[PDB]
Design a protein around this ligand. Structure first.
Ligand SMILES: O=CNCc1cc(COc2ccc(CCNC(=O)CC[C@@H](NC(=O)CC[C@H](NC(=O)CC[C@@H](C(=O)O)[C@H](CCC(=O)O)C(=O)O)C(=O)O)C(=O)O)cc2)co1
Ligand SMILES: Nc1nc2c(c(=O)[nH]1)N[C@H]1C(S)=C(S)[C@@H](COP(=O)(O)OP(=O)(O)OC[C@H]3O[C@@H](n4cnc5c(=O)[nH]c(N)nc54)[C@H](O)[C@@H]3O)O[C@H]1N2
Ligand SMILES: Nc1nc2c(c(=O)[nH]1)N[C@H]1C(S)=C(S)[C@@H](COP(=O)(O)OP(=O)(O)OC[C@H]3O[C@@H](n4cnc5c(=O)[nH]c(N)nc54)[C@H](O)[C@@H]3O)O[C@H]1N2
Ligand code: SF4
Ligand code: SF4
Ligand code: SF4
Ligand code: SF4
Ligand code: SF4
Ligand code: SF4
Ligand code: SF4
Ligand code: SF4
Ligand code: SF4
Ligand code: SF4
Ligand code: SF4
Ligand code: SF4
Ligand code: SF4
Ligand code: SF4
Ligand code: SF4
Ligand SMILES: [Cl-]
Ligand SMILES: [K+]
Ligand SMILES: [K+]
Ligand SMILES: [K+]
Ligand SMILES: [K+]
Ligand SMILES: [K+]
Ligand SMILES: [K+]
Ligand SMILES: [K+]
Ligand SMILES: [K+]
Ligand SMILES: [S]
Ligand SMILES: [W+6]
Ligand SMILES: [Zn+2]
Lengths: 341, 129, 80, 430, 190, 129, 116
């Protein structure tokens, strides 16, 4: 059954579900499939161009629903279910070993990883103190002395002062009926009292003499969440964290190899990379030259999508080891072994 | 065109029902669809042209009319009556009150004729007893 | 399958795709530098009689760069 | 079939010199690398009138005459005229333009090229405030920021972007990826569709936008919260993009020469480019239209001292655009005869100027049938520069490239026609 | 948008100094046995204190042997409009003439011919391949400025300048050129 | 309807002028007015319908075309040529360069025909000499 | 004070007034150590006059940081102290000088203007 761009293959109970939106078009499912039931569309075209086809096509007439493609998928885009629970929970089925975690007691809620995450898998919340609670002072406006010239309202840098302006009438021959200070907003800078032409404002700032007691030291709280299906274990959070609260382990080990002279800088691999490994460094000063295509394998997972997307094969991916749950099937062992290079 | 159908009163339809729903007056006041002039232009129709209104629940032909009470962008007005009630949402959500107002409909120009009052009722096919 | 397809009647002959393509760039230094080829070279497409003209579709890797470079959708990646 | 390489294209100021011409017989039947426009010039369109001989209108009907008669009748018109206008020039080669200057001198004529309807206002502006330019090769190899201001190169200089923006340069090996592309135009043109930044400003308001941009650049605050339809905040964001360039190029065109303010739009743009150089290297190039409009302004300047709108009536050269320009003399009815060469003012002058062409002798050195030939009294067909005749042309940023002769033609070249016209104008005046 | 200062200051990227460019081209000049010598417009043109850059420049090709195949040239260096390269001081207000030191270098040395570049005290126009200098001149007098950088080859700039006799700086520059004509003893070097 | 007339280049009008200004190709490429689709519906016209453009300075008949390069609200585009130059502003403000761009004009639908190239020029009434 | 400008039933009155600049009614020192700064953004959020600005970005392998710079605009800063108290790594040095040095460093405001 195909709805939109998603694909579900059913036999009756086994069910293989493909989620187009999660597919990074790396091609690994197509390679590992023993029955060559998967054909993967061009990586570059599917990422850079509008297409109505799905990223994958699977032939149900050959599909034997063994679930190796679902296992191997680094992006959680293929899930086979058996009666009808996902094999991700069945121990008989080999699983690839990966993890991503944040120590919430170490985390200080700076939100660097939320920003850095190439998959937007991270949510970081933080509750800041209210403004009034980091500040102390007294402020009162004598409204009868006040002549409503508006200068304090204008000069107030936080718009804490409000004046109820009006057009006068013979019944109410005044240009304003009230003036107020919102102490939730006032930061006691003193500007209003200094500009007031009739000394109608009383304001005293207490921060320095009484700050130690009157102002409480801010405790900033919050939580973290890593979406396990969006998460792909590039490790950006681990590397971006100023307090080393984030820990990531990856499924694959390998190498990235780039031929700078074959590369013609079409930017395909840069846009294809789901882990933000590849970039075009900007020259820092005029006349300076840069590495044409820059990598940082710390963020690399060796899924192979860049190599697949490059039309001049200027970029190649090697893969030395695939970390998995113990494999007892020998059909499974050799297909996992077939993806090593 | 996909639009939002709103329904209710007009003095002309109020005058008409107390004059007589068997009268020509009633077709003129209630068998109409009010549109912003900008929407009529986008649809390529003028006042007096007929419109076919289709919804999940029915269909009807009504005469296009320039709204003198301006509508929000994307909304049309058919006065309460059997023409409007060919197309609005019948379900009451267990309140007994149907959803007479704010129903997604499709409108398209048509050269078909507006059904007068007794002819409109024949589609429901009353069987004697 | 997805492949390169030209719509010459919409084409301007502007040459952006010819220059933008890395395969063309790799094989022809002049194309890499924004020129039409004067050397004899085998590349994916050229501007000929004023419009884009596909000469070696087998070398196309369907990366999509040319498509990004065309403002008038005269060269595309689609089925067949 | 014959393939002629390294041909220079005779259409727009991009002056591409890598055209391949396909030659069958003695005829150009196809092209390689030339864009859709360049190709259309090289190849003959079927059913299109290519005048084979001179023509003269005898009251109301055209009759074929010989070269000697047509040139003779034209020479007498100019000799007896007391305010002749010699206009066009941009679509022929420089040596013919040089003969034209001498002929205008001999006839006491006003000589003027299409600059007067084009980048003339840029000439006026650069005479007042300056002219900071570079050649295409510095753009390709250095340009960090590329602006197209009031020009639509995808339709008017079709290969300009591919050669200067998508091209991979020495310090810009990644081509398009190494450049921030900015387009300023009230329309979302096909050029704007490729831009990183599209300032879709209000028409006729460039001068105001450039005033805000320059005040900001020199550290001042922008008076109003929106200018030319662009909110204050993005005026400042745009000035920062320009200030942080390593090498910036401002390409500009008809959107500001034809717009309200005309030469003063170019004026304020130039001076901003000048002032930007205290923060970042910056330069500009006017997107000159015809393949050799620039060549005329060069020749006329170096022979006479002035670039266009040159009046020889007093012997001495004098220069005041607004008085001595083609449209000035025609619309104010000063010109009593007009010689057009390699240009089409019938199609491309305004109504008021055409009304005057209807009243005066019009000579047209033109190979094809045009609105000008429909308003002409004498038609003299020449060999076409770049296809049948060779000579110097000047690219939009001053780079000289020689036009090539690809096939033969029995017709005379512009140069030969003008030298015969000049000899017999002297005969009449003696 | 930059410049080099002194003969040991390299250009961006290319990483070769003025001194090495001058020496190498002098070497090339005589190795092709050209009739004329290298024709040198020095670095740091028109700036107070540049006389030292000039004198250092003059020494760089002195050890090259002239070798014209045509003509009678017996000098390896031709320095042009050196009036503009004879400036002392450090800013325009302590600006002084250093033409005596320049003229005396010329008198003592046999490998150099010069021309002066004499101020005529007119409203005139400046036009040079010294792009960065012309932008600086435009910065000073505020007058209309043209520029043209030529790919892989050179640059250029154009600025009007009024050499008013009543102004202090043009007055000194007029004198510097006269000093150069007159304190150089042998006319065969100028 | 009062609109702002903008004029200039088109790849098709360039192809046409280098093919031949005596050809039909040229009328199809330059005797046109480009409009936003909403404006064409506001005026009640479709692609291929003709429009009469009148300004302070002249008048012309051109064929309406839907703009593939979107225009700002209230603006129309006629390619450079003798049709556009029937109506744009001639005055140069003492610069020698006319105001070819951004001219207030009045546009209205018309059943009159587009004048081909030689017929259009006769409007100026060339007298021989 | 502009009361009459507001009150005039015919809008016949124009009252202008030039007020002092904010910087001139306030005094203090503020410095951000950008090496200590980890770009958590909390000072930018809490600053009640939007004087602090951070050059946010998406990281790339060439530039593996979430921001490239941070700045305080002293034309806007009124030295309330909030940023320095909220900074989790104490990268902001900030001290208000109003009470010890206010007589000398803050000029008493002259308010100018005209009427018509
Ligand atoms: N291929 C080669 C090539 C060559 C070229 C051509 O390039 C060049 C290169 C360089 C330039 C020159 C640069 N331009 C300038 O210096 C402009 C002026 C300059 N100002 C001054 O010098 C200021 C002096 C002034 N002094 C006075 O007024 C003194 C008054 C005394 C008195 O009254 O006697 C006073 C005495 C009082 C008393 O009597 O007691 C006193 O001495 O102070 C002052 O106050 O500072 C500035 O405005 O900056 C031109 C062209 C192109 O291409
Ligand atoms: N409404 C409006 N009007 C405009 C403009 C606009 O934007 N809007 N733009 C204006 C501008 S910038 C310009 S430059 C003008 C267009 O300037 P024009 O000169 O009118 O442009 P073309 O119609 O290309 O005319 C060139 C002519 O030279 C002929 N030709 C080609 N080669 C040769 C040769 O070797 N010898 C000779 N003798 N002739 C040759 C061609 O057949 C052609 O007829 O239009 C102007 N008018
Ligand atoms: N196909 C074709 N190509 C040609 C020619 C041709 O006739 N046909 N002629 C040649 C000649 S002579 C020339 S001069 C060049 C001209 O090349 P361009 O300078 O591109 O000339 P245009 O296409 O007239 O105008 C360019 C843009 O200016 C914009 N514009 C209009 N008003 C304003 C405004 O107020 N502000 C701003 N910023 N922009 C505005 C228009 O939207 C238009 O997109 O083209 C040359 N190439
Ligand atoms: S593998 Fe997982 S990701 Fe790579 S393609 Fe097959 S599915 Fe989409
Ligand atoms: S299921 Fe077993 S077979 Fe059917 S596809 Fe996924 S893998 Fe290839
Ligand atoms: S980054 Fe390290 S610290 Fe800043 S949030 Fe994500 S985890 Fe907590
Ligand atoms: S300033 Fe002094 S007077 Fe003017 S309003 Fe605020 S308080 Fe009332
Ligand atoms: S004190 Fe500073 S803040 Fe509190 S009100 Fe007077 S001004 Fe606005
Ligand atoms: S790993 Fe890459 S993805 Fe999984 S979280 Fe840390 S960042 Fe977001
Ligand atoms: S690598 Fe292949 S793809 Fe990534 S850039 Fe260089 S070329 Fe374009
Ligand atoms: S880089 Fe490492 S990750 Fe980004 S794609 Fe090529 S492989 Fe998959
Ligand atoms: S697709 Fe990638 S490769 Fe095939 S052409 Fe367009 S660019 Fe050259
Ligand atoms: S395709 Fe799009 S880009 Fe390649 S040429 Fe024809 S137009 Fe210029
Ligand atoms: S661009 Fe201007 S020049 Fe280069 S080809 Fe197309 S037309 Fe001839
Ligand atoms: S007069 Fe001067 S003061 Fe009296 S009200 Fe009008 S403004 Fe305020
Ligand atoms: S708070 Fe301390 S850390 Fe977080 S940003 Fe402002 S400064 Fe850098
Ligand atoms: S001090 Fe109060 S104001 Fe000055 S910056 Fe830190 S916060 Fe914004
Ligand atoms: S000094 Fe400390 S206390 Fe005295 S004012 Fe400035 S802040 Fe409030
Ligand atoms: Cl075609
Ligand atoms: K305020
Ligand atoms: K006070
Ligand atoms: K870390
Ligand atoms: K496209
Ligand atoms: K042709
Ligand atoms: K250079
Ligand atoms: K009032
Ligand atoms: K804030
Ligand atoms: S032009
Ligand atoms: W032009
Ligand atoms: Zn010099």
């Amino acid at each position: 059954v195909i709805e939109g761009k998603n694909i579900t293959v059913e036999r009756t109970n086994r069910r293989l579900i493909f989620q187009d939106c999660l597919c990074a078009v790396c091609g690994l499912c197509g390679e590992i499939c023993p029955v060559s039931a998967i054909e993967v569309n061009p990586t570059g075209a599917m990422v850079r161009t509008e297409q109505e086809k799905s990223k994958i096509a699977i032939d149900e007439n050959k599909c034997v629903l063994c679930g190796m493609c679902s296992s191997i998928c680094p992006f959680q885009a293929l899930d086979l279910q058996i009666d009808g629970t996902s094999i991700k929970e069945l121990a008989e089925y080999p699983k690839i070993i990966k993890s991503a975690e944040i120590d919430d007691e170490t985390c200080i809620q700076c939100k660097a990883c939320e920003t850095a995450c190439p998959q937007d898998a991270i949510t970081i919340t933080r509750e800041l103190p209210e403004r009034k609670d980091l500040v102390t002072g007294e402020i009162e406006i004598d409204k009868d002395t006040c002549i409503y010239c508006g200068m304090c309202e204008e000069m107030c840098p936080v718009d804490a002062i409000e004046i109820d302006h009006q057009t006068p009438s013979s019944a109410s021959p005044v240009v304003a009926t009230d003036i107020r200070v919102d102490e939730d907003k006032c930061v006691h800078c003193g500007i209003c009292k200094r500009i007031c032409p009739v000394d109608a404002i009383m304001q005293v700032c207490r921060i320095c003499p009484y700050g130690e007691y009157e102002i409480k030291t801010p405790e900033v709280t919050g939580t973290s969440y890593i979406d396990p299906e969006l998460c792909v274990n590039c490790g950006w959070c681990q590397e971006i964290c100023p307090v080393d609260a984030a820990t990531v382990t990856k499924p694959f080990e390998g190498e990235l190899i780039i031929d700078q002279d074959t590369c013609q800088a079409c930017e395909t691999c840069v846009m294809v990379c789901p882990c933000n490994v590849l970039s075009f460094p900007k020259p820092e000063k005029p006349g300076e030259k840069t590495t044409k295509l820059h990598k940082d394998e710390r963020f690399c997972i060796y899924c192979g999508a860049c190599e697949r997307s490059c039309p001049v094969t200027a970029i190649t991916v090697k893969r030395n080891r695939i970390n998995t749950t113990p494999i007892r099937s020998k059909a499974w062992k050799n297909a996992f072994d077939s993806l090593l290079k | 065109m996909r639009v939002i159908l709103n329904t209710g009163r007009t003095i002309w339809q109020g005058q008409a029902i107390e004059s007589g729903k068997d009268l020509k007056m009633y077709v003129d006041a209630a068998a109409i669809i009010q549109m912003n002039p900008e929407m009529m232009k986008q649809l390529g129709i003028a006042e007096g042209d007929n419109v076919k209104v289709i919804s999940e629940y029915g269909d009807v032909v009504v005469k296009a009319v320039e709204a003198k009470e301006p509508l929000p962008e994307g909304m049309v007005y058919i006065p309460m009556g059997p023409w409007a009630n060919r197309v609005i949402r019948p379900y009451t959500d267990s309140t007994a009150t149907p959803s007479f107002k704010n129903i997604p409909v499709e409108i398209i120009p048509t050269d078909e004729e507006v059904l007068d009052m007794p002819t409109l009722m024949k589609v429901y096919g009353k069987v004697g007893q | 399958a997805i492949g390169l397809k030209a719509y010459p009647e919409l084409c301007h002959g502007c040459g952006n795709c010819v220059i933008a393509c890395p395969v063309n760039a790799l094989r022809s230094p002049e194309v890499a530098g924004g020129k039409g080829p004067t050397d004899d070279v085998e590349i994916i497409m050229i501007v000929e009689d004023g419009v884009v003209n596909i000469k070696n579709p087998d070398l196309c890797g369907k990366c999509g760069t040319c498509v990004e470079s065309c403002p008038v959708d005269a060269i595309r990646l689609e089925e067949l | 079939m014959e393939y002629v390489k390294n041909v220079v294209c005779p259409f727009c100021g991009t002056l591409c010199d890598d055209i391949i011409c396909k030659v069958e017989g003695n005829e150009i039947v196809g092209t390689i690398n030339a864009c859709r426009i360049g190709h259309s010039k090289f190849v003959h369109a079927e059913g299109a009138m290519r005048y084979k001989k001179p023509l003269i209108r005898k009251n109301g009907e055209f009759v074929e005459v010989s070269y000697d008669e047509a040139i003779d009748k034209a020479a007498k018109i100019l000799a007896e005229s007391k305010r002749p206008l010699m206009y066009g020039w941009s679509c022929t080669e420089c040596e013919a333009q040089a003969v034209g200057v001498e002929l205008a001198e001999e006839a006491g004529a006003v000589i003027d090229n299409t600059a007067s309807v084009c980048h003339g206002p840029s000439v006026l502006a650069l005479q007042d405030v300056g002219y900071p330019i570079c050649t295409f090769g510095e753009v390709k190899n250095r340009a960090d920021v590329v602006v197209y201001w009031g020009c639509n190169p995808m339709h008017a200089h079709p290969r300009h972007m591919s050669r200067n923006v998508f091209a991979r340069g020495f310090f810009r090996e990644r081509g398009r990826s190494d450049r921030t592309l900015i387009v300023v135009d009230p329309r979302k043109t096909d050029s704007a569709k490729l831009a990183d930044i599209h300032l879709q400003l209000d028409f006729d308001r460039d001068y105001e936008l450039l005033d805000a941009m320059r005040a900001c650049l020199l550290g001042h605050e922008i008076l109003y919260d929106e200018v030319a339809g662009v909110p204050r905040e993005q005026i400042e964001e745009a000035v920062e993009v320009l200030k942080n360039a390593q090498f910036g190029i401002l390409f500009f065109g008809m959107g500001i020469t034809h717009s309200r303010g005309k030469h003063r739009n170019i004026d304020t743009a130039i001076m901003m480019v000048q002032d930007l150089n205290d923060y970042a290297k910056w330069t500009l190039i006017p997107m000159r239209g015809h393949y050799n409009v620039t060549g005329f302004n060069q020749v006329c300047t170096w022979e006479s001292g002035y670039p266009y709108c040159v009046d020889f009536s007093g012997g001495e050269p004098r220069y005041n655009p607004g008085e001595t320009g083609a449209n000035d003399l025609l619309q104010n009815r000063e010109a009593d005869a007009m010689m057009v060469i390699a240009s089409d003012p019938g199609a491309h002058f305004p109504q008021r100027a055409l009304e005057r062409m209807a009243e005066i002798p019009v000579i047209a050195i033109e190979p094809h049938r045009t609105p000008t030939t429909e308003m002409a009294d004498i038609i003299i067909p020449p060999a076409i520069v770049g296809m049948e005749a060779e000579g110097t042309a000047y690219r939009m940023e001053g780079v000289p490239i020689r036009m090539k002769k690809v096939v033969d033609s029995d017709l005379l070249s512009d140069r030969e026609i003008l030298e015969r016209l000049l000899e017999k104008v002297r005969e009449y005046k003696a | 948008g930059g410049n080099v200062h002194g003969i040991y200051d390299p250009a961006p990227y290319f990483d070769i100094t003025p001194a090495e460019i001058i020496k190498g081209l002098a070497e090339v000049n005589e190795k092709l046995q050209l009739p004329h010598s290298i024709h040198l417009h020095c670095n740091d043109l028109g700036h107070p204190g540049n006389y030292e850059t000039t004198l250092a420049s003059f020494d760089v090709p002195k050890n090259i042997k002239p070798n014209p195949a045509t003509g009678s040239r017996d000098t390896v260096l031709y320095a042009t409009h050196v009036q503009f390269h004879s400036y002392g001081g450090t800013t325009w207000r302590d600006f002084v003439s250093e033409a005596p030191k320049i003229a005396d270098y010329v008198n003592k040395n046999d490998h150099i011919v010069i021309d002066v570049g004499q101020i005529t005290l007119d409203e005139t126009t400046t036009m040079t391949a010294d792009g960065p200098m012309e932008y600086d001149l435009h910065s000073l007098n505020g007058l209309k400025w043209a520029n043209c950088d030529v790919e892989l080859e050179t640059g250029s700039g154009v600025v009007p300048f009024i050499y008013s006799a009543r102004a202090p700086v043009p007055a000194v520059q007029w004198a510097i050129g006269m000093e150069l004509f007159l304190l150089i003893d042998n006319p065969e070097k100028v």
